[PDB]
Amino acid sequence: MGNSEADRQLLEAAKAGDVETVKKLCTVQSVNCRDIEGRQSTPLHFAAGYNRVSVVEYLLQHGADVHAKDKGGLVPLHNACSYGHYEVAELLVKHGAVVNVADLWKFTPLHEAAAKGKYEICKLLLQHGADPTKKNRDGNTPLDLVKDGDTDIQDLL
Amino acid sequence: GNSEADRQLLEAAKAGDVETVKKLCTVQSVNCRDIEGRQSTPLHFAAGYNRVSVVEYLLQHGADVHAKDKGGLVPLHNACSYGHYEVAELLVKHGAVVNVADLWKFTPLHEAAAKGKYEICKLLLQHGADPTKKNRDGNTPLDLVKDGDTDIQDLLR
């Protein structure tokens, strides 16, 4: 089974930053619908990972769930951090995003940012109390995931 | 005042309204200036307000990375002052001069440093930004760093 045409259109619009279509399709029932076809992202996951600030804003003001997890355990903040979207990350935290949350393999937003080499995001998450000693399933901290030649995030971490 | 077309183009650039930019932007209009503000061009507006699609279209349609507003600022100043990394990346890729100075001799690195933007500073540095250049006051970008953005200070050290 697939999503209704309307939830499909809502998810697409969020991925594309089409705030006018989001307004049209966003209700209390639909706001946290899931892309069952893909990896079960909510509109907010899509908006966050694609850096659609105006959609993130609208979604959050309409009861979007900062705690909702996709098929792999990720919350929208993971998406924002993995892709280095600083403002989005800041908006999520401002609206209640838990910074220390872990996905199914115990990766935290900070693991993501570190591995991705996203310096400002690391500082942001730390500046907001993210725990650098957290280990994922492999026993790796965020520091452990920092690439060689990325000397500057190491010292930060 | 500006012609209506020019006014609409400048507003659309500020707004990130790329479809309206595409309809108004010609070789004659692309570097028009806002005579009722600080003589920003459409690229100054798009860069300052982090309109990536607009920045990209404009760069591909004759927009001048060397154009200066009433204060001698080029669009890279705008991007750096407001911490828009991708915008700054796009400007530098299209040949923005990293060491350009405004009327007070502030360089983009002076702006990034004062506004506490690390990755921007790192980008400018990697591109030959001169951390020793002094503005008219005798201040280097290092001089302008807020104590304590010690990472920035260390970067510029």
């Binding site: 990896r39 996951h45 966050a48 990972g49 | 699609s53």
Partner: peptide, 11 residues
Amino acid sequence: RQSPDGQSFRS
């Protein structure tokens, strides 16, 4: 473990 939905750059 696959990527999240999204991308780094708007360009």
